[PDB]
Design an enzyme around this catalytic site. Structure first.
Site: not given
Ligand SMILES: N[C@H](CCC(=O)O)C(=O)O
Lengths: 150, 151
Positions: A78-80
């Site tokens: 989870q980079f977020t």
């Molecule tokens: N922030 C998510 C990341 C999900 C993914 O890894 O595709 C998105 O833009 O959907």
């Protein structure tokens, strides 16, 4: 390195939709990986996850840990977590490790997870891919560790 | 103040079990109040919660926020975030605010959320009660904010 550990009745991970992962009772572990994590960072994480005592037991509290209760773990990358929310309403994730090389790291971590417990009891998700996970939060219990506080 | 924010297709918050809260799309936020939190500490959370642009909208990514797409927020008080785990395996909640003051600081926060987005859009749990939350993690997307790294 960054982890959010949510205590769960169970979890069901899905890609694009299909279930490819499942745990019943255990821990879900959102794992963010800084660009300057050294293996040590990954040990601390692996350790605490297994080792933290997020279950009461028989008239005692915060006592037994995953291992004790023979429970699983769902490790999701989870980079977020290195979402920076100090610039503005759009988050820049600069401080996270570059995906191609972060992926190596994750896997190392996932192997070492097994060696530090029981391979039959560590589940993961698809790194690159978009995921949809149903979580049953038990309590709930949310726990945060940023390994860069040592 | 600490907060975890996860983007989600929906959520169910049941208690000891019989239900008390649903949301379709939007966010869930486990929010930990630190023993010392000023009202500022609140605002930053609330502000950043509504305004964080976390949904891809069109050919744009990380662009639209929760108020834009007209989505809900479920606000779950979670002290275990000030579970100090640094030394020991038994988590240490000494930085957490006492549940009596915590209750109103949480209340006040829920007001402000409503007061700033919409009464119907803000959903909650039963403070300090064993709760069960079915959460449909979309993405997934997870964000930490310790309001103490802010200047
Ligand atoms: N922030 C998510 C990341 C999900 C993914 O890894 O595709 C998105 O833009 O959907």
């Amino acid at each position: 390195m960054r982890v959010v550990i949510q205590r769960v009745k169970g979890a069901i991970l899905s890609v694009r939709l299909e279930i490819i992962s499942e745990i019943k009772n255990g821990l879900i572990c959102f794992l963010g990986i800084h660009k300057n994590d050294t293996w040590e960072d990954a040990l601390y994480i692996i350790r605490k996850c297994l080792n933290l005592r997020l279950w009461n037991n028989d008239n005692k509290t915060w006592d037994k840990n995953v291992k004790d209760l023979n429970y699983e773990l769902l490790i999701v990358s989870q980079f977020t977590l290195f979402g920076n929310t100090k610039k503005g309403n759009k988050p820049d994730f600069h401080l996270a490790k570059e995906p191609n090389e972060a992926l190596i790291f994750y896997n190392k971590i996932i192997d070492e997870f097994k060696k530090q417990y029981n391979d039959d009891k560590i589940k993961i998700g698809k790194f690159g891919n978009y995921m949809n996970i149903d979580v049953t939060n038990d309590g709930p219990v949310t726990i945060y560790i940023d390994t860069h506080d040592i």
